[PDB]
Amino acid sequence: VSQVRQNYHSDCEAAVNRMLNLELYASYTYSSMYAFFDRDDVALHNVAEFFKEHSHEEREHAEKFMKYQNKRGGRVVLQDIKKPERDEWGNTLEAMQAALQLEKTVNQALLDLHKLATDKVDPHLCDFLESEYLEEEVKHIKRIGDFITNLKRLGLPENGMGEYLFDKHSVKE
Amino acid sequence: VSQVRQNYHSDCEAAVNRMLNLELYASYTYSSMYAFFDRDDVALHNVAEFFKEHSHEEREHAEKFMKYQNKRGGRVVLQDIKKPERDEWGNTLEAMQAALQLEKTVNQALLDLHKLATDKVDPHLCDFLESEYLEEEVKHIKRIGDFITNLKRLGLPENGMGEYLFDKHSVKE
Amino acid sequence: VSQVRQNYHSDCEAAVNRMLNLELYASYTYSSMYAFFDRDDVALHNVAEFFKEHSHEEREHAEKFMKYQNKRGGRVVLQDIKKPERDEWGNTLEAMQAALQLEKTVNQALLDLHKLATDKVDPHLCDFLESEYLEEEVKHIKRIGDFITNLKRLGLPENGMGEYLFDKHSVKE
Amino acid sequence: VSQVRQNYHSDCEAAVNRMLNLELYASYTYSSMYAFFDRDDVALHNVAEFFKEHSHEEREHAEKFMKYQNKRGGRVVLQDIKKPERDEWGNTLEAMQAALQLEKTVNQALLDLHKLATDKVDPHLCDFLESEYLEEEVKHIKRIGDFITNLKRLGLPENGMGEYLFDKHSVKE
Ligand SMILES: [Cl-]
Ligand SMILES: [Cl-]
Ligand SMILES: [Cl-]
Ligand SMILES: [Cl-]
Ligand SMILES: [Cl-]
Ligand SMILES: [Cl-]
Ligand SMILES: [Cl-]
Ligand SMILES: [Cl-]
Ligand SMILES: [Cl-]
Ligand SMILES: [Cl-]
Ligand SMILES: [Cl-]
Ligand SMILES: [Cl-]
Ligand SMILES: [Cl-]
Ligand SMILES: [Cl-]
Ligand SMILES: [Co+2]
Ligand SMILES: [Co+2]
Ligand SMILES: [Co+2]
Ligand SMILES: [Co+2]
Ligand SMILES: [Co+2]
Ligand SMILES: [Co+2]
Ligand SMILES: [Co+2]
Ligand SMILES: [Co+2]
Ligand SMILES: [Co+2]
Ligand SMILES: [Co+2]
Ligand SMILES: [Co+2]
Ligand SMILES: [Co+2]
Ligand SMILES: [Co+2]
Ligand SMILES: [Co+2]
Ligand SMILES: [Co+2]
Ligand SMILES: [Co+2]
Ligand SMILES: [Co+2]
Ligand SMILES: [Co+2]
Ligand SMILES: [Co+2]
Ligand SMILES: [Mg+2]
Ligand SMILES: [Mg+2]
Ligand SMILES: [Mg+2]
Ligand SMILES: [Mg+2]
Ligand SMILES: [Mg+2]
Ligand SMILES: [Mg+2]
Ligand SMILES: [Mg+2]
Ligand SMILES: [Mg+2]
Ligand SMILES: [Mg+2]
Ligand SMILES: [Mg+2]
Ligand SMILES: [Mg+2]
Ligand SMILES: [Mg+2]
Ligand SMILES: [Mg+2]
Ligand SMILES: [Mg+2]
Ligand SMILES: [Mg+2]
Ligand SMILES: [Mg+2]
Ligand SMILES: [Mg+2]
Ligand SMILES: [Mg+2]
Ligand SMILES: [Mg+2]
Ligand SMILES: [Mg+2]
């Protein structure tokens, strides 16, 4: 084993690699959303830029797992980054609904990793998850839920004026 | 009696303690409104922050009565702060209507205290009320009434787009 | 359930609401202490301002629980804020002794909530408690204990000169 | 009558002149206290300077009544400024006790003038009293009472060390 490795279970190492792939998957889905909202026949630029920012964030989340793996003496093992589930995202409401589920999927995986870390008596990995990931997920989920609420209030999906207003007044940088 | 006490009727002292409790009650009701508008299924953040600010104001109003009581040689006597009348506040219109009635209840109590102070020939307490409270109440009542007018114009309670517009254009910090 | 809610047990949600009430209760007790030490026949202003500051802190602690509840998709439910146990607080020693017990009551409730969160496998709530509350409690308890030690050294309750010296040299802003 | 005079009763004009004399009397008493505490066999300089400051304040209070009288079209009529009741003031406690009674005498006279003004339906004179005098009296009375409390706590009159400590830690500029 690595000279640095101490109290780091094989199962946690593998789970970190799986998590990294999921972060990368989330990044790629948000890129798809960005591109959709930048289409000339969609054209909700502030929405698009929100998704772009989230794509970037998720990619940083992935980088931080790679660094974590090496710090603990584990070995980064990459897998294919699967393409997003959809090619087209309907409208701002549908996209936000998809983003909420994505975030909850990410969160569940983080929570599962934390439970594994707990089981294996790995306080360092717990702390990393709690300090760098779990609160950010709560924040994202809350923000997106709040957006959904507003989109529904604004009459989505039918009310185009409402969709326009949201893009112009909600999606603050 | 206190060495400082001069021209301060027992009835005014007691009425000051009652008023203090009412200020605290008002603060707590506005906190409830804040929390309601911060819910993920409500999500009107600027509305929420308006109520939060008013909660803070009312708590300062209470502190100022405590200081006043001691300055005059009276004794602060606290009672339970009753929970707000509702757990849920419907929508921005219903909440603003409740806030208007709350402010008018506060104002009536202030006016009643002023009449007591007058009756007891206490110019100092009159002046305090006039200089620190009565004008602020008029301002609040006016602001909230103006909001109600606008909320009705915007189609509340039914018109969700109108509610959204209000949150984004009216509730200035 | 709320669209945001994920891994948040009903029991934890209720316990958060109870905790919030206790923070508010602590705030109100410290306000009472402030008012007592501001009395003309007590007149220990720096002591009074220490308690005032703690009142404000506790109220901020309460606000942070309200925000936490909403972030997790729970629902804030308020109860009456009970009046403090005493109307009068004796002297600086008695008050500090009461404040120590108050802080320990708060701490015990936080520790109990953490144990519940642990039992329910809620790392997010653990982290919140550990990062925002538990260390602050240790600090407060230590500070107040240190004050008690000094008050006893200074001859409280009998030694008025000692009480005066404490107010003028210990209770630093 | 003066060309400016409007709604100004002869009784109020005379009462203003009496009040002015009382302000001047208060000033002169505080000067006496200053001189006593500056004696080489008393030597409590910070105490002395507190009284000096109050002497100056009272003299400004008198000036403001003179200006008020002329503004309303009354005529300033001066009387002798009587010497203070004592030549010697004992100690810091005795002096503060005398200052408390002096302030309460001043306050009573102000309150009496306000009642006269009320009776004569003179809102301008009411307002002047409330805005320029009555709150300052409450503040002074409170401050001095607080000092008395502390002086008693410190063991006055017998405890010279306590008197010294008060001069060095209480009588802030
Ligand atoms: Cl290992
Ligand atoms: Cl598709
Ligand atoms: Cl985080
Ligand atoms: Cl706009
Ligand atoms: Cl009285
Ligand atoms: Cl309700
Ligand atoms: Cl006002
Ligand atoms: Cl849940
Ligand atoms: Cl009691
Ligand atoms: Cl902490
Ligand atoms: Cl010192
Ligand atoms: Cl006239
Ligand atoms: Cl004499
Ligand atoms: Cl004044
Ligand atoms: Co752009
Ligand atoms: Co992520
Ligand atoms: Co990067
Ligand atoms: Co983020
Ligand atoms: Co905000
Ligand atoms: Co108020
Ligand atoms: Co405050
Ligand atoms: Co008046
Ligand atoms: Co205001
Ligand atoms: Co202060
Ligand atoms: Co607290
Ligand atoms: Co606050
Ligand atoms: Co931690
Ligand atoms: Co603290
Ligand atoms: Co000097
Ligand atoms: Co004066
Ligand atoms: Co001058
Ligand atoms: Co006035
Ligand atoms: Co003054
Ligand atoms: Mg090797
Ligand atoms: Mg392995
Ligand atoms: Mg933009
Ligand atoms: Mg495929
Ligand atoms: Mg954190
Ligand atoms: Mg007494
Ligand atoms: Mg009474
Ligand atoms: Mg805002
Ligand atoms: Mg009840
Ligand atoms: Mg005014
Ligand atoms: Mg729902
Ligand atoms: Mg439940
Ligand atoms: Mg201080
Ligand atoms: Mg009770
Ligand atoms: Mg910490
Ligand atoms: Mg003429
Ligand atoms: Mg005349
Ligand atoms: Mg000095
Ligand atoms: Mg004579
Ligand atoms: Mg004033």
Side-chain angles (χ1 to χ4, degrees):
Chain A
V1 294
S2 156
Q3 69 195 322
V4 306
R5 196 188 190 105
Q6 183 174 32
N7 193 42
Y8 194 52
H9 199 277
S10 179
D11 292 355
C12 292
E13 174 179 1
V16 164
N17 282 329
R18 291 191 305 269
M19 189 71 231
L20 160 57
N21 185 265
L22 183 57
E23 299 284 356
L24 288 166
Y25 176 79
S27 176
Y28 199 30
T29 287
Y30 277 132
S31 288
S32 181
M33 294 182 183
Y34 154 68
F36 176 74
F37 288 95
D38 181 66
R39 287 166 58 155
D40 76 271
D41 62 355
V42 182
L44 292 162
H45 187 59
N46 294 324
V47 176
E49 291 283 331
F50 172 84
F51 293 128
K52 178 178 277 297
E53 291 169 355
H54 278 274
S55 177
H56 285 74
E57 178 169 3
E58 297 302 333
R59 237 294 191 166
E60 299 304 307
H61 287 174
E63 292 169 27
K64 187 178 302 183
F65 279 118
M66 294 191 191
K67 183 179 175 181
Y68 184 85
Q69 187 75 283
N70 279 330
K71 281 168 67 170
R72 287 301 302 275
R75 296 293 170 250
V76 174
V77 178
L78 299 175
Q79 302 298 341
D80 291 352
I81 309 166
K82 292 297 194 176
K83 70 182 186 165
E85 134 208 298
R86 292 172 63 176
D87 297 320
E88 187 252 29
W89 300 99
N91 60 64
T92 304
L93 176 56
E94 288 199 11
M96 287 293 178
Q97 288 168 150
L100 180 64
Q101 295 310 307
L102 177 67
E103 296 283 340
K104 291 183 149 186
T105 294
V106 172
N107 198 35
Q108 190 62 60
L110 292 159
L111 292 169
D112 291 349
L113 183 48
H114 193 284
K115 182 53 159 62
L116 178 62
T118 297
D119 290 351
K120 301 319 246 262
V121 199
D122 190 335
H124 187 271
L125 179 49
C126 289
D127 163 86
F128 177 62
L129 300 166
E130 284 163 60
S131 300
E132 303 300 320
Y133 297 84
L134 296 184
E135 164 62 9
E136 196 63 19
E137 285 306 313
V138 161
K139 287 183 193 145
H140 289 175
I141 293 164
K142 181 60 163 65
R143 190 157 191 220
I144 300 160
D146 286 355
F147 287 162
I148 294 161
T149 299
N150 280 281
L151 291 156
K152 291 176 170 184
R153 161 184 294 124
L154 281 162
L156 279 277
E158 299 91 349
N159 195 320
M161 179 180 293
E163 192 167 17
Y164 177 86
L165 289 170
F166 179 89
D167 171 267
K168 295 301 187 179
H169 305 81
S170 293
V171 249
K172 301 335 296 191
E173 212 188 331
Chain B
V1 294
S2 156
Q3 69 195 322
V4 306
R5 196 188 190 105
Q6 183 174 32
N7 193 42
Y8 194 52
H9 199 277
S10 179
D11 292 355
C12 292
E13 174 179 1
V16 164
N17 282 329
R18 291 191 305 269
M19 189 71 231
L20 160 57
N21 185 265
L22 183 57
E23 299 284 356
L24 288 166
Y25 176 79
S27 176
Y28 199 30
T29 287
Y30 277 132
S31 288
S32 181
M33 294 182 183
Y34 154 68
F36 176 74
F37 288 95
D38 181 66
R39 287 166 58 155
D40 76 271
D41 62 355
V42 182
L44 292 162
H45 187 59
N46 294 324
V47 176
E49 291 283 331
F50 172 84
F51 293 128
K52 178 178 277 297
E53 291 169 355
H54 278 274
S55 177
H56 285 74
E57 178 169 3
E58 297 302 333
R59 237 294 191 166
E60 299 304 307
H61 287 174
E63 292 169 27
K64 187 178 302 183
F65 279 118
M66 294 191 191
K67 183 179 175 181
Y68 184 85
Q69 187 75 283
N70 279 330
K71 281 168 67 170
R72 287 301 302 275
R75 296 293 170 250
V76 174
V77 178
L78 299 175
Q79 302 298 341
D80 291 352
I81 309 166
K82 292 297 194 176
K83 70 182 186 165
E85 134 208 298
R86 292 172 63 176
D87 297 320
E88 187 252 29
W89 300 99
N91 60 64
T92 304
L93 176 56
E94 288 199 11
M96 287 293 178
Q97 288 168 150
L100 180 64
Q101 295 310 307
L102 177 67
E103 296 283 340
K104 291 183 149 186
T105 294
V106 172
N107 198 35
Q108 190 62 60
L110 292 159
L111 292 169
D112 291 349
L113 183 48
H114 193 284
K115 182 53 159 62
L116 178 62
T118 297
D119 290 351
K120 301 319 246 262
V121 199
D122 190 335
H124 187 271
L125 179 49
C126 289
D127 163 86
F128 177 62
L129 300 166
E130 284 163 60
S131 300
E132 303 300 320
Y133 297 84
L134 296 184
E135 164 62 9
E136 196 63 19
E137 285 306 313
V138 161
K139 287 183 193 145
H140 289 175
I141 293 164
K142 181 60 163 65
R143 190 157 191 220
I144 300 160
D146 286 355
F147 287 162
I148 294 161
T149 299
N150 280 281
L151 291 156
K152 291 176 170 184
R153 161 184 294 124
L154 281 162
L156 279 277
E158 299 91 349
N159 195 320
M161 179 180 293
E163 192 167 17
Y164 177 86
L165 289 170
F166 179 89
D167 171 267
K168 295 301 187 179
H169 305 81
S170 293
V171 249
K172 301 335 296 191
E173 212 188 331
Chain C
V1 294
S2 156
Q3 69 195 322
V4 306
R5 196 188 190 105
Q6 183 174 32
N7 193 42
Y8 194 52
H9 199 277
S10 179
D11 292 355
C12 292
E13 174 179 1
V16 164
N17 282 329
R18 291 191 305 269
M19 189 71 231
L20 160 57
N21 185 265
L22 183 57
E23 299 284 356
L24 288 166
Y25 176 79
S27 176
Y28 199 30
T29 287
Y30 277 132
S31 288
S32 181
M33 294 182 183
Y34 154 68
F36 176 74
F37 288 95
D38 181 66
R39 287 166 58 155
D40 76 271
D41 62 355
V42 182
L44 292 162
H45 187 59
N46 294 324
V47 176
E49 291 283 331
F50 172 84
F51 293 128
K52 178 178 277 297
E53 291 169 355
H54 278 274
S55 177
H56 285 74
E57 178 169 3
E58 297 302 333
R59 237 294 191 166
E60 299 304 307
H61 287 174
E63 292 169 27
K64 187 178 302 183
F65 279 118
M66 294 191 191
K67 183 179 175 181
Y68 184 85
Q69 187 75 283
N70 279 330
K71 281 168 67 170
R72 287 301 302 275
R75 296 293 170 250
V76 174
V77 178
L78 299 175
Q79 302 298 341
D80 291 352
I81 309 166
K82 292 297 194 176
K83 70 182 186 165
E85 134 208 298
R86 292 172 63 176
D87 297 320
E88 187 252 29
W89 300 99
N91 60 64
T92 304
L93 176 56
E94 288 199 11
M96 287 293 178
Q97 288 168 150
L100 180 64
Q101 295 310 307
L102 177 67
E103 296 283 340
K104 291 183 149 186
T105 294
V106 172
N107 198 35
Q108 190 62 60
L110 292 159
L111 292 169
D112 291 349
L113 183 48
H114 193 284
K115 182 53 159 62
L116 178 62
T118 297
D119 290 351
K120 301 319 246 262
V121 199
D122 190 335
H124 187 271
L125 179 49
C126 289
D127 163 86
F128 177 62
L129 300 166
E130 284 163 60
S131 300
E132 303 300 320
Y133 297 84
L134 296 184
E135 164 62 9
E136 196 63 19
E137 285 306 313
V138 161
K139 287 183 193 145
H140 289 175
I141 293 164
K142 181 60 163 65
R143 190 157 191 220
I144 300 160
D146 286 355
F147 287 162
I148 294 161
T149 299
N150 280 281
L151 291 156
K152 291 176 170 184
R153 161 184 294 124
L154 281 162
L156 279 277
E158 299 91 349
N159 195 320
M161 179 180 293
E163 192 167 17
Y164 177 86
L165 289 170
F166 179 89
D167 171 267
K168 295 301 187 179
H169 305 81
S170 293
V171 249
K172 301 335 296 191
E173 212 188 331
Chain D
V1 294
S2 156
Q3 69 195 322
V4 306
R5 196 188 190 105
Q6 183 174 32
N7 193 42
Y8 194 52
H9 199 277
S10 179
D11 292 355
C12 292
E13 174 179 1
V16 164
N17 282 329
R18 291 191 305 269
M19 189 71 231
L20 160 57
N21 185 265
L22 183 57
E23 299 284 356
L24 288 166
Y25 176 79
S27 176
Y28 199 30
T29 287
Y30 277 132
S31 288
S32 181
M33 294 182 183
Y34 154 68
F36 176 74
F37 288 95
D38 181 66
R39 287 166 58 155
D40 76 271
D41 62 355
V42 182
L44 292 162
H45 187 59
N46 294 324
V47 176
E49 291 283 331
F50 172 84
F51 293 128
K52 178 178 277 297
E53 291 169 355
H54 278 274
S55 177
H56 285 74
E57 178 169 3
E58 297 302 333
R59 237 294 191 166
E60 299 304 307
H61 287 174
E63 292 169 27
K64 187 178 302 183
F65 279 118
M66 294 191 191
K67 183 179 175 181
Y68 184 85
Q69 187 75 283
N70 279 330
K71 281 168 67 170
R72 287 301 302 275
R75 296 293 170 250
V76 174
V77 178
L78 299 175
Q79 302 298 341
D80 291 352
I81 309 166
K82 292 297 194 176
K83 70 182 186 165
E85 134 208 298
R86 292 172 63 176
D87 297 320
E88 187 252 29
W89 300 99
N91 60 64
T92 304
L93 176 56
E94 288 199 11
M96 287 293 178
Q97 288 168 150
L100 180 64
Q101 295 310 307
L102 177 67
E103 296 283 340
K104 291 183 149 186
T105 294
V106 172
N107 198 35
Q108 190 62 60
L110 292 159
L111 292 169
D112 291 349
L113 183 48
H114 193 284
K115 182 53 159 62
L116 178 62
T118 297
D119 290 351
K120 301 319 246 262
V121 199
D122 190 335
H124 187 271
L125 179 49
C126 289
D127 163 86
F128 177 62
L129 300 166
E130 284 163 60
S131 300
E132 303 300 320
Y133 297 84
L134 296 184
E135 164 62 9
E136 196 63 19
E137 285 306 313
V138 161
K139 287 183 193 145
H140 289 175
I141 293 164
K142 181 60 163 65
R143 190 157 191 220
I144 300 160
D146 286 355
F147 287 162
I148 294 161
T149 299
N150 280 281
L151 291 156
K152 291 176 170 184
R153 161 184 294 124
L154 281 162
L156 279 277
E158 299 91 349
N159 195 320
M161 179 180 293
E163 192 167 17
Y164 177 86
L165 289 170
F166 179 89
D167 171 267
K168 295 301 187 179
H169 305 81
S170 293
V171 249
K172 301 335 296 191
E173 212 188 331

